[PDB]
């Protein structure tokens with residue numbers, strides 16, 4: 001039994017999974033006992049692209065080893081992709097109840113809790129990432145993200161300034177940081193953080209939209225109408241954006257051309 005396992009493992013180490021899974025099944029023909037192999041068989045399906053396949057083989061590991069923390073975590077993950085967070089949130093804590101020392105799991109727990117519409121709770125968990133280390137750069141975002149989600153902008157704008165300290169390179173953050181000044185009502189403060197986002201990703205159509213929206217508040221339809229087109233050649237599919245263009249040319253005093261754009265918007269969603 002021993003060898004059939006170590007073999008399947010090296011095929012796991014070449015990205016060969018329906019290949020590995022043959023040999024893992026054969027370890028588990030000889031010895032169904034070793035709940036290492038039951039673990040890994042599920043991990044060669046968490047690869048080969050098979051998730052409620054993986055679960056069954058994790059539960060059969062968690063039969064024979066009921067405090068395999070590593071098996072709780074990845075069973076949690078395997079419902080998290082399938083996308084059922086009732087279940088993941090649970091199995092992720094059955095993981096932490098054993099290993100409360102897991103800025104991995106404590107991160108992955110706020111990613112489950114983030115889709116319960118549930119941000120007041122989901123933030124407790126992210127701050128259990130802060131404690132272990134500030135090393136995990138992604139998660140600095142998802143904090144401020146969840147503060148942005150509760151209309152709680154002043155706070156959000158702090159945690160992207162920490163996000164961007166760490167990776168100045170992420171235009172995701174740059175974008176969202178310019179959005180928290182779009183609500184919290186500080187606009188040419190927003191523009192210049194949308195500009196620092198396009199610098200990094202110029203085919204971001206929504207940077208062009210919400211930067212071009214930010215001049216629209218401050219009256220400046222000279223320059224707002226510019227960016228609204230920069231947006232629309234990069235996505236002609238928008239309804240309330242050919243709309244927002246025509247609303248902008250309506251103020252330029254300019255009805256002849258401002259009408260054509262509303263009809264553009266009316267081809268696509270006529271209902272509204």
Ligand SMILES: [Ba+2]
Pocket residue numbers: 018
């Ligand atoms: Ba195949």
Ligand SMILES: [Ba+2]
Pocket residue numbers: 048049050
């Ligand atoms: Ba498949």
Ligand SMILES: [Ba+2]
Pocket residue numbers: 052082
């Ligand atoms: Ba299913």
Ligand SMILES: [Ba+2]
Pocket residue numbers: 052053
């Ligand atoms: Ba299925």
Ligand SMILES: [Ba+2]
Pocket residue numbers: 067068069
């Ligand atoms: Ba253990």
Ligand SMILES: [Ba+2]
Pocket residue numbers: 184185186
């Ligand atoms: Ba203010």
Ligand SMILES: [Ba+2]
Pocket residue numbers: 188218
């Ligand atoms: Ba101004």
Ligand SMILES: [Ba+2]
Pocket residue numbers: 188189
């Ligand atoms: Ba100002």
